[PDB]
Amino acid sequence: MTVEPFRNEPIETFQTEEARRAMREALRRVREEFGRHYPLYIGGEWVDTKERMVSLNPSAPSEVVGTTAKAGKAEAEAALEAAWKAFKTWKDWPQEDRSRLLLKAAALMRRRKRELEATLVYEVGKNWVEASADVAEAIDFIEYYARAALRYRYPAVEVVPYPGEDNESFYVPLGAGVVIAPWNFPVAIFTGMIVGPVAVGNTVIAKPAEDAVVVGAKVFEIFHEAGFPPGVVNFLPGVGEEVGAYLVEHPRIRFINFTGSLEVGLKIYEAAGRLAPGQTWFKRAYVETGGKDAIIVDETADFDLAAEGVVVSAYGFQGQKCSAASRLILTQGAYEPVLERVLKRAERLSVGPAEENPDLGPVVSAEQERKVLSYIEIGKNEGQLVLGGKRLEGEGYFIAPTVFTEVPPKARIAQEEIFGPVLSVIRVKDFAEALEVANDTPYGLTGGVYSRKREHLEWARREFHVGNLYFNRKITGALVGVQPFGGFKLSGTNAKTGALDYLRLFLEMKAVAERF
Amino acid sequence: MTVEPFRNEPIETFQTEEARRAMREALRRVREEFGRHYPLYIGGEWVDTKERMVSLNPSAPSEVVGTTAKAGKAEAEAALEAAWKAFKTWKDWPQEDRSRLLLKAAALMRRRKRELEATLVYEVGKNWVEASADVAEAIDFIEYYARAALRYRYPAVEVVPYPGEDNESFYVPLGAGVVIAPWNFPVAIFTGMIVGPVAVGNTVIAKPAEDAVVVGAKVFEIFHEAGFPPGVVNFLPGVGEEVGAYLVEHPRIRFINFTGSLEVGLKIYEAAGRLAPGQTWFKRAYVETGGKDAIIVDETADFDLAAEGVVVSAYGFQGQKCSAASRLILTQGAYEPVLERVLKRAERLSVGPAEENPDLGPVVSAEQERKVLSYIEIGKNEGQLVLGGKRLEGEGYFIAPTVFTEVPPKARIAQEEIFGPVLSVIRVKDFAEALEVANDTPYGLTGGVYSRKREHLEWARREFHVGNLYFNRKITGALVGVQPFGGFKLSGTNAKTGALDYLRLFLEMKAVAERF
Ligand code: NA
Ligand code: NA
């Protein structure tokens, strides 16, 4: 199979009238459909349950954006049976055939871009550009993994020949596994975590995050229309830990693909290490578990450029990103000029209902609001509040862009992932101390440096110990293919998404010799 | 750096007078050196302890091959401190420099081949050719990994470019880890498990198996002479669980490479999934955990060829291989002709002191002897004993080649890894039933089929679910580079030794973007 070389899907800026019109149209269609109910998807069919889950608009939480079915253990078991039944034949599809199926899915998703974006706006409180980036990244994962999977096709392994024998090594998929997806990128990461394993012949049971069950269902509409065989992909929205625990601990779950909090990731990894009664394999668990990401600025930087990148990085999608800049490390010569610019920019940010395309929408939920406000209370005891730090008026979960200064590097707000619009500013003596402070957290996901000094940039290239490092630009928005995404340390298992290496995680190798 | 293309080191057959002369001299010198004492190796120096460990000759266990120092927790901590200190600079060596160090180590090992083989003969009771194959495979691992490591050199990752930016992805080593090595290939697997991680910039603390401490020490003499910087490789012989438990559970151990029994492997994998107090990463654990390997023979096979391959696979090194044929699955038409040929061949096998170059030496220890003899008692009540089934006369741990037939597929002797010269023969109706039986164990390491029918061979290629499958030849003796070695299911984590993919297990990836 021959397709155009991979290119990233353009992110819509909505700078044209047509783009704005198209979005208004999509927002209207989505809200007219707020009454919809979305069942589970098991074995190629939509399957309803007695109990339901409600999804809320975080910009107006009295407004319901949809309802879904609610899976329990019985539905998880049915999905698992379906996934293994499907695996028996799906594994034997030619790679070309599986990759074409993905390409079809990407084409369908592209045709529904505005609808998915508008659903992100209403369901998880993304502004318009954040919503478009999310959907574009989802499309990218599908396009990229469809092509990358062909690099592993039968028989892909380079071996040394031996006289009088054929020696043939090749990759085979693992089996049925479970995907536990986040609320913050519920099209992009939801899709990537599913289609990567599926592309190479695995089957998947996907549990969406509770806050993003509607958009997850709409992604499953796309999978169904694309024509994935029954059991290949399954959709199990659920409340709390029931469904996830049941599957993670199950003797017949082959692998676990997880993106979310460290608390949950640590539990998953520990469980995956155990042999459940009757289990006949060593489980693989891939976890991406957040960050406490810093931007360093030194006295040689373009301070205006730095301030812009810091504000984008800290406050994009309300700081609810594993990649978000939650620490700003300033050398002495950079401190005042950069802090003054950051404050001037941040104080001009709009906050309001996501559909109005504000700089910040609401945080995602009452629980998220509670967590972020609690960290703000902690921060007032650790650092100096200089901007924001309060809830804004309205039932929507609106929190003001927040800055703490004079934060000790070992303060809770300088160590713990807040996942809200809260930036901690740390003053350091020089670039060496900046790196020391940057590295001294349990995490290692993203980081950035603003500097014109070549020796500082290259030193950071070697010693700023994060999986995704960026110089003189924002530290968020890793592009599929361009920036393999994944971290070090307690940021997870370094499963690099949007990279050739990702697919290898979902394969095992067989070596077959014939002596003639 | 440019060297000749990889070739496997020839396995000496000792058919020439030159080879016999050299081996006889090597054996005499090793024997004359019985009783020698070997310290620990920590931080680039030999370090002795008050306590000591004894290594016995399994052919004559009154004879002490040598003694070694005995590591406890304190020595383990010292080695870990040394390994981390070394890592800080070793990770920064150009790959070309590290690879040249390996090639030097391979050259030194090659010059000491006969000595190392003779040490295997006396310490673990390998006959001459089994000993030669073990040392040759060790040399191969060093030669192969030295070259393979260059395929990962800075900056090795294929990424999609982006306008106005440099995007550079590259691999970095993990840190300091622990190697827990087996007694059955205590030069080959000991060496492979250490030099693979070290090649790409990790540092290693190695615990040799108790029964094979002297030969582990001789491998370290080679590492020391080659000039590995202090702390890069460390040698910690120990008794029982102390050293291994301490390191596996340590918050500051980065990875664990293990080859041995399933029972220990399960414990290691479970422990690796836990976050020890203060630990700041998700541990990687690579485990190879044995097999219950079958050769299938159908009625179309060359029965003489099959019988010879079965006897080599079942009884080479007394069946003490993770790859050994412990099951012979015979279709109805193949049953009598193949069994009669196997029995006639096996009853002619010589058993005696390994120095005499018998077909079989002793099993490795008194405990191993006790275990194999216990399984023989269990076997007597499960199938029909038709050959051997007893200890032979002498102080050495000599067990007769043993065959049970009409063995139920779910019998303990058809399911559990005995790791001795005990073959279980299972009679089945046809090839489909043969495959079902072959697949119905918790393991998936090696397997074989003797058959002239193409459709049966290609069927097995697709459906005989083992990591290393061989047609019309023995199922043991996988060659580095030729046959990537590693299994499925409870045979471990499919870390394919002697393959390009092995080194990727010991690296993590960084992605660095500069916007100009
Ligand atoms: Na919601
Ligand atoms: Na011994």
Short mmCIF file of C-alpha atoms in Angstrom, two decimals, chain B residues 31 34 49 63 88 90 160 166 200 211 234-235 246 259 264 274 277 293 313 324 367-368 374 401 420 435 448:
data_model
loop_
_atom_site.label_atom_id
_atom_site.label_comp_id
_atom_site.label_asym_id
_atom_site.label_seq_id
_atom_site.Cartn_x
_atom_site.Cartn_y
_atom_site.Cartn_z
CA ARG B 31 42.39 -29.08 37.71
CA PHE B 34 41.53 -26.37 42.13
CA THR B 49 35.19 -10.89 52.62
CA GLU B 63 36.55 -31.82 45.11
CA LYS B 88 27.58 9.49 35.48
CA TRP B 90 30.16 5.95 31.38
CA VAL B 160 9.05 14.01 11.04
CA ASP B 166 15.33 21.25 14.67
CA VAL B 200 24.79 1.18 25.54
CA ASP B 211 26.86 -23.30 41.47
CA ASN B 234 30.52 -5.43 39.53
CA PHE B 235 30.64 -9.08 40.69
CA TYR B 246 18.15 -6.44 48.50
CA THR B 259 17.32 -15.64 33.76
CA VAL B 264 11.96 -16.65 41.20
CA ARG B 274 6.26 -1.88 43.41
CA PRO B 277 10.12 4.04 49.56
CA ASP B 293 9.46 -27.65 25.25
CA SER B 313 17.59 -31.83 22.35
CA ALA B 324 15.58 -28.79 26.16
CA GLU B 367 19.53 -30.52 45.29
CA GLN B 368 19.13 -30.74 41.52
CA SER B 374 11.57 -36.80 42.85
CA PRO B 401 18.71 -40.83 30.47
CA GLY B 420 17.05 -33.04 33.99
CA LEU B 435 -0.37 -28.74 18.10
CA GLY B 448 10.24 -28.35 17.09
#
